[PDB]
Structure formats: C-alpha cells, structure tokens
Structure 1
C-alpha cells in the first residue's frame, strides 16, 4: 500500500498510449517542477490546471489538448490511489498520507454548542526536505489550487530558538515559509471511507 512517482507515471502511461511513455513521463516531472517552483518562487500568481497545461505545451511542445488530459489524469490517478487506502509518495516533492481519525469534541464556533467531530479518514501532505528547502531558500512564492483535488499554500513560521533534539543545544531559527496542503471536497469524500454512502444535501 504505497505508490511511488514511478508506479504512478506507469499507470498514467498505460492509460495514455496515444502519448509516448517518455513524454507521459517528462510531463509528470515538469508538472512537479512547475508546482515546486511556484511554491518557492512562483511569480506567475496562483497556479491552476490551465497554467500547468500551457507550460507543458510551451516546454514540451505537447499539444494543448493532450497536455490538459494529462494534468487532469495526473491528479485523478493520485485520487484513485488514495481512495483505495494507498499512500502516494512523490520523490523530490512530498508524500500524501492517509490517517484514520477518532471522534473528538467539537462545537459551533459561533454558538458554542458542543458538536462532536466524527471519526474519519483524512488525506495529509508531508513536504519533503528537498521541497521544503526551496520554499525557505527562495523566500516563498505563490500558491496552487486544483479544484476537487486540493490546494497548496505557504504557511509562515515565526523565528524561534529551537533545540538540537539530540544534544539539547539551542539553535537560532529564522522565520520561514513552509508548504501546506488542504484536500479538496471530492478528495475528502472518496478518501474518507466513512462517507461513501448517502451524501449530505438538504436546503434548510
């Protein structure tokens, strides 16, 4: 129950024959590189699906039509993996874990009435060191938003005196930014094996 960058590019390939494997492969790499770049430097504002397609077109001369069908598939394969209980691990970027959460005390932040947070399975993103370094080294860039899949943004970490967990020595840590992912609705419902039933849909 673990899908790597390669095992994923393999599934996208076997489902995109009209597209050469080496291309189906370069694409995934370019996307993750565009994504990583966006978060660290960004520049071109928020990254979207149409930005990742245009880039593929520009960088790999790939037809826009196929570039779009891939980007979409790319995120669709990951979703498929996760909902199956599989964790997606992408080298040089980050891993997408699955965690089963037990019910805990909640409430209505507005009213204050105790309303418990049901047990569920949530998807989480763990930024690799490679990527984390870029974000702090670059000084942080823009964000990424892929509807139905999830969003990537940068969170600020104020400076603080930290400890070498081994020696106990203090170390001076500078403020920095770090990547943060928020699963999209479509991904939260498919991944959470506690809601694949009668959906929630009433008007009052």
Structure 2
C-alpha cells in the first residue's frame, strides 16, 4: 500500500466533520511535520506520548585510504533524526 500525508489530512477532515474541511486540514497537517523539524534543529527530543520519541544522532566524518579497495576517502560528518517506538507501535499494534 502507498500512503502520503494527503491521506492523513483527508482523514481528519472527514472525522472532525464540521470544523476541519479537507482544503484547510492540508495546512493543519503541514504544521505537524514543520514543527517537529524546527524543534529537532533547535536541540530537542520530540516525544509523542504512546507513539515514541524522535531525537537526533550524529555520524562521524571519515578520512584515509579505505583498506578493502584502496580508494581514498574524504567523507564528512552529518546529523540526522532517528526514532524509538512506543506502545502504540508495540502492544497496541501487536495482537
């Protein structure tokens, strides 16, 4: 199955029937995924109670001659977000 955020933004318009319309609930859903991001560059662990918590990790930068292939390397460091699953995705999801 494919699933994209318009599928999420449609749903909440369809169930909060008289306050969210699909045309506005697209923006409402935008600010979900925007603000996670603005938090995660600010220094923060974004906790979503029952669901899990997203925090940052850093990869080390690597330099040298790769000793399998002999190719020289100049790979820099970088940060990324990662995730730790909670009960909604454990015992609520598992039957």
- The TM-score by the shorter chain falls in which range? 0.7 to 0.9
Work out whether 1:57 is the aligned partner of 2:57. Answer: no
Give the match for residue 123 of structure 1: 81
Give the Å deviation of 1:90. 0.7
TM-score by length of 1: 0.39
Aligned to 1:88: 46
5+ residue gaps, structure 1, are 1-44, 139-204
2:4 equivalent in structure 1: 48
User: How far off its partner does 1:115 sit?
Assistant: 2.5
1:18-167 aligned within 5 A: 45-61=1-17, 62-104=20-62, 113-135=71-93, 137-138=94-95
Q: What value does the CA root-mean-square deviation take over the aligned residues?
A: 2.6
- Alignment partners' CA distance in 1, 2:73 and 2:87: 38
Structure 2 unaligned spans of 5+: none
* Greater than 6 Å deviation, 4+ residue runs: 105-108
Considering fraction of residues, name the structure with more strand: 2
The alignment covers a number of residue pairs equal to 91
Q: Distance in 2 between matches of 1:64 and 1:123?
A: 29
C-alpha distance in structure 2 between counterparts of 1:105 and 1:97, whole Å: 27
Matches of 1:112 and 1:83 in 2, distance apart?
36
